[PDB]
Amino acid sequence: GESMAQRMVWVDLEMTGLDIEKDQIIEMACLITDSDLNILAEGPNLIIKQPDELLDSMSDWCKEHHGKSGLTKAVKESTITLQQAEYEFLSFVRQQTPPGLCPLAGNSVHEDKKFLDKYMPQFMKHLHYRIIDVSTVKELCRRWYPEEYEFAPKKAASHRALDDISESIKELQFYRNNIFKKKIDEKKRKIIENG
Ligand code: NA
């Protein structure tokens, strides 16, 4: 019960840009973790068809980054509509999390949430309204733990959805292991009794 409710729905998107009024989702990946960040299930990892005219009018940043990663070409070749993609993700979370209870998780995942609330509303209805924003923890680490912040893992930052999810989980695990309070565990308790 409570273990299921404490799962996390990790999502990362690529979009044609940051303009919620015009830009569209072009890539989406999703992983489920337990409350302790262990990966329980890998969800769909999908490249979503969007029109040539939209791709051709992307900002230079998006043209350069989605171009060199291969994403732009893959979007043009995709046969997956937004609606079919949403169904794959919704079916996946229905198999993995109790309705309404689990949050989106990722770096600045409120941006993904803005796009998903608009373009995948039925997927979002399965989730809690709260988020696990790894970048909130990043911003607190930089302020409160500046020495530890220097040791956070370097990111490849490939702007491909599934790879970036994995780096987000690793960043949050780094914070848990380095800036949160230490606790007892099964191994430490046995040592205390032996001593
Ligand atoms: Na992102």
Residue numbers in the entry: 4 to 198
Sentences from the paper on this structure:
Among them, Oligoribonuclease (Orn) is unique as its activity is required for clearing short RNA fragments, which is important for cellular fitness. Here, we show that Orn exhibits exquisite substrate preference for diribonucleotides. While other cellular RNases process oligoribonucleotides down to diribonucleotide entities, Orn is the one and only diribonucleotidase that completes the terminal step of RNA degradation. From this we propose a general model of RNA degradation, wherein a combination of exoribonucleases process oligoribonucleotides down to diribonucleotides and Orn completes RNA recycling by cleaving diribonucleotides to nucleoside monophosphates.
(A) Crystal structures of REXO2 bound to pApA and pApG. The structural overview (left) shows a C-terminal helix that is unique to Orn orthologs in higher eukaryotes and in the current crystal forms is stabilized by crystal packing contacts. Residue numbering for REXO2 refers to its cytosolic isoform lacking the mitochondria-targeting pre-sequence. Structures of OrnVc (and REXO2) with different diribonucleotides, including di-purine, di-pyrimidine and mixed substrates, revealed identical binding poses. Additional hydrogen bonding between purine residues and Orn in the 3' or 5' position correlates with a small, but detectable preference of OrnVc for purine-containing substrates. Together, the structural analysis uncovered Orn’s mode of substrate binding, which is conserved from bacteria to humans and indicates a unique selection for linear diribonucleotides with a 5’ phosphate.
